[PDB]
């Protein structure tokens, strides 16, 4: 029996339980976005704004149900409307991560018919992050 560690084992929604995505695996996800006609976009946050928190609820009456701070991140430029070239998305990942080397950065895609985000996963975490385990140290 292995024990799932509760210490420094923070996750990041979709794909965070798999081995970290290789560049080839990231490019395959981007192909998926383009093949389906979805709208790619990049979002980023500094470390203190990366995970869901409760601080604003100090101002509330009894209305905190499904309110969390840090769900919104910051938009990198604009969503790439009409983009059909995967290489263009990959170049924006590079540009975003270069401008904000110490930020969390996630790639998302939007469906304008459902009007919802249809995909998303982390593409960068700051090198100073120490609140996550590598896949082989998640259970002891």
């Amino acid at each position: 029996m292995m024990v799932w560690t509760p210490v420094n084992n923070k996750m990041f929604e979709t794909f965070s339980y798999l081995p970290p995505l290789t560049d080839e695996q990231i490019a395959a996800q981007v192909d998926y976005i383009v093949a389906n006609g979805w709208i790619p976009c990049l979002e980023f946050a500094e470390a203190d704004k990366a995970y869901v928190s409760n601080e604003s609820a100090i101002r509330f009456g009894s209305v905190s149900c499904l309110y969390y701070d840090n769900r919104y991140w910051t938009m990198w430029k604009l969503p790439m409307f009409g983009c059909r070239d995967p290489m263009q998305v990959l170049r924006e990942i590079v540009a975003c991560t270069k401008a904000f080397p110490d930020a969390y950065v996630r790639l998302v895609a939007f469906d304008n018919q459902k009007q919802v985000q249809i995909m998303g996963f982390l593409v960068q975490r700051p090198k100073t992050a120490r609140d996550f385990q590598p896949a082989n140290k998640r259970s002891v």
């Binding site: 799932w4 084992n9 998926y32 009894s62 499904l66 919802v116």
Partner: protein
């Protein structure tokens, strides 16, 4: 003298069988699978169903003359014979929108399925489908949030949601409930839930459970950095108790409650759905009792109608069946009503049991929930059947893991993410599914332990509810 009052009994078909009627776009339409008694013509049987679910009774009444029966009567406008059946017919009935109370699923059911199923003149009757027109759909508050808003509130995109019913069904203390909840959530499940029959009982009172569960949700959320929830059961004996339980969830600031809509009922359910809308709570709907009504091919109400009724009454989630699990539901049948639950516009398609084109006129979609007898090996099939817009629940499939709840949750979460990744890369889950899982069990020790325990476990039986 014109037409006057003549006392006495006449055939229903003289008034209620109208084969040349052109249906109106505001009419509610019903498709009844009808088995008449020997010596009862199908036309008379369909007319009877139409009459006794709208305006008519067994003998002529004088009061008809004070109103306009033409304006109000239900109309059997078409009868199809059933292929393969000697004595089965599909009777189509049209009901004027005027017959129904705005916003009341209760009233719609009371007319359409109130008395006609007990008539001596028929041997069996099944309601297969309803066409709910936009003009009536627009009278309903509908689901408190819907699929898009739920995903947006939870900040969860790109994969199926993962859930888990706490087991044993009954008999756990409040503290042990919260203990199990925390260990499930912290391992990678998005949700856990009260079992449908967990309300308030001598072994565990509801408010004790809500508090310990709140502690568990917040602990797992802090630990993982992901939004967590537990469907706290508001199902109760009275509306007043139901509401007290909802109010406590609100005051704890937790995301989600649940209701058993058939055993609690449509009147209570609609009330709760309005409450959840006004207070920002997600509402998970359990379909307990549905199979009493919906299992048999010859008599009852098909689940697709019970699903439409829930979407109108209000619910953010509704259980849909698994195809591959311990409870019955055929692939094509399920795919049909999943579309009716989620989509805005669904065209007639008899190969999936859809008898009418259904326009939902922008009423929010309801998230289907696949639950019951499913485990890691089922994951590729589930993802292939439902896509991302579904919750997949693993009760026994998490709490039955050899290493406990957190490893059990991580096994399920790894399996889902592996399949989601594989699909996104262009792999065919219908054929390559076993390969995706085997590669994953080889990589993840948690998943391997799950794969080994349940490798030979299948649920394959003759289907009762065939199209």
């Amino acid at each position: 003298a014109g037409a006057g009052f003549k006392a006495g009994v006449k055939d229903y078909r003289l008034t209620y069988y109208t084969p040349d009627y052109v249906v109106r776009d505001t009419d509610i339409l019903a498709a009844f699978r009808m088995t008449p008694q020997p010596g009862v013509p199908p036309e008379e049987c369909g007319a009877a169903v139409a009459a006794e679910s709208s305006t008519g009774t067994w003998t002529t009444v004088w009061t008809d003359g004070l109103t306009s029966l033409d304006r109000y009567k239900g109309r059997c406008y078409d009868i199809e014979p059933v292929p393969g059946e000697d004595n089965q017919y599909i009777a189509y009935v049209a009901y004027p929108i005027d017959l129904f109370e705005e916003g009341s699923v209760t009233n719609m059911f009371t007319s359409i399925v109130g008395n006609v199923f007990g008539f001596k003149a028929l041997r069996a009757l099944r309601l297969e489908d309803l066409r709910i027109p936009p003009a009536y759909v627009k009278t309903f508050v509908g689901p408190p949030h819907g699929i898009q808003v739920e995903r947006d509130k939870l900040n969860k995109y790109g994969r199926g949601l993962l859930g888990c019913t706490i087991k044993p069904k009954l008999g756990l203390s409040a503290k042990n409930y919260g203990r199990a909840v925390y260990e499930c959530l912290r391992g990678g499940l998005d949700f856990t839930k009260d079992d449908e029959n967990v309300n308030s009982q001598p072994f565990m009172r509801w408010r004790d459970r809500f508090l310990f569960v709140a502690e568990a949700i917040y602990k797992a959320q802090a630990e993982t950095g992901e939004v967590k929830g537990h469907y706290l059961n508001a199902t109760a004996g009275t509306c007043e108790e139901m509401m007290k339980r909802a109010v406590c969830a609100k005051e704890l600031g937790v995301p989600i409650i649940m209701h058993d809509y058939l055993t609690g009922g449509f009147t209570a359910n609609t009330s709760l759905a309005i409450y959840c809308r006004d207070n920002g709570l997600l509402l998970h709907i359990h379909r307990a009792m549905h199979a009493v009504i919906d299992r048999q091919r010859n008599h009852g109400i098909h689940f697709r109608v019970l699903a439409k009724a829930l979407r109108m009454s209000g619910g953010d989630h509704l259980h849909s069946g698994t195809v591959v699990g311990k409870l019955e539901g055929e692939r094509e049948v399920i795919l049909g009503f999943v579309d009716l639950m989620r989509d805005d516009y669904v065209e007639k398609d008899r190969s999936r049991g859809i008898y009418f084109t259904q326009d939902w006129c922008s009423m929010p979609g309801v998230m289907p929930v696949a639950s019951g007898g499913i485990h890691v090996w089922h994951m590729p099939a589930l993802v292939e059947i439902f896509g991302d817009d579904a919750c997949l629940q693993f009760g026994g499939g998490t709490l039955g893991h050899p290493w406990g709840n957190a490893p059990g949750a991580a096994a399920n979460r790894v399996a889902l993410e592996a399949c989601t990744q594989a699909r996104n890369e262009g792999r065919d889950l219908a054929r390559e599914g076993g390969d995706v899982i085997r590669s994953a069990c080889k990589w993840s020790p948690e998943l391997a332990a799950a794969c080994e325990v349940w490798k030979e476990i299948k649920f394959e039986f003759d289907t009762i509810d065939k199209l």
